[PDB]
Enzyme design. Structure first.
Site, mmCIF file in Angstrom:
data_model
loop_
_atom_site.group_PDB
_atom_site.id
_atom_site.type_symbol
_atom_site.label_atom_id
_atom_site.label_comp_id
_atom_site.label_asym_id
_atom_site.label_seq_id
_atom_site.Cartn_x
_atom_site.Cartn_y
_atom_site.Cartn_z
ATOM 1 C CG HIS A 1 -2.444 -1.170 0.985
ATOM 2 N ND1 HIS A 1 -3.444 -1.154 0.147
ATOM 3 C CD2 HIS A 1 -1.855 -2.299 1.996
ATOM 4 C CE1 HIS A 1 -3.694 -2.225 0.852
ATOM 5 N NE2 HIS A 1 -2.951 -2.725 1.632
ATOM 6 C CG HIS B 1 -7.012 -3.844 7.148
ATOM 7 N ND1 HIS B 1 -7.707 -4.212 5.213
ATOM 8 C CD2 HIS B 1 -8.500 -3.675 7.108
ATOM 9 C CE1 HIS B 1 -8.961 -4.234 5.002
ATOM 10 N NE2 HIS B 1 -9.610 -3.912 6.343
ATOM 11 C CG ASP C 1 -11.582 -0.812 6.984
ATOM 12 O OD1 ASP C 1 -11.236 -2.244 7.200
ATOM 13 O OD2 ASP C 1 -12.169 -0.303 7.037
#
Ligand code: P5P
Length: 124
Positions: free
Chosen positions: A12, A119, A121
């Site tokens: 990411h 993570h 989201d």
């Protein structure tokens, strides 16, 4: 082997550019970060901000995660993100992606000591 924090960075984070420079950005980056290896990962977002500034989102607006845990945090500011989504005509091993560059708030889940993003989201 790879901790959740380092997998977050590989899937990411794209600190090298401030935005996607062409519509080909997603086909090149999904493959370079190995998101096309045993399947085509269907959707993935890259954040074009410095690691430090994305790490700081872990102390900003606490929200619930899509999974219902509450260790998610929303950025006060918008960030440059590139949205990658697999085309309808795409079939592994020939993964093809549409690129969408935008400035959006991100929501990440944080964990560990130091308390870092693990993570992605959603972006809003
Ligand atoms: C290497 N291989 C497995 N597990 C590892 C490795 N290095 C650290 N860990 C631990 O398990 C998690 C792996 O990331 P996730 O795939 O579970 O998100 C790390 O957080 C670490 O606790």
């Amino acid at each position: 082997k790879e901790t959740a924090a380092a997998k977050f960075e590989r899937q990411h984070m794209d600190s090298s550019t401030s935005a996607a420079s062409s519509s080909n950005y997603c086909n090149q980056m999904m493959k370079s970060r190995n998101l096309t290896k045993d399947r085509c990962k269907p959707v993935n977002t890259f954040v074009h901000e410095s690691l430090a500034d994305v790490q700081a989102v872990c102390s900003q607006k606490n929200v619930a995660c899509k999974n219902g845990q509450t260790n998610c945090y929303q950025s006060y500011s918008t960030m440059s993100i590139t949205d990658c989504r697999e085309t309808g005509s795409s079939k592994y091993p020939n993964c093809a992606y549409k690129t969408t560059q935008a400035n959006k708030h991100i929501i990440v889940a944080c964990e560990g000591n130091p308390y870092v993003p693990v993570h992605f989201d959603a972006s809003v």
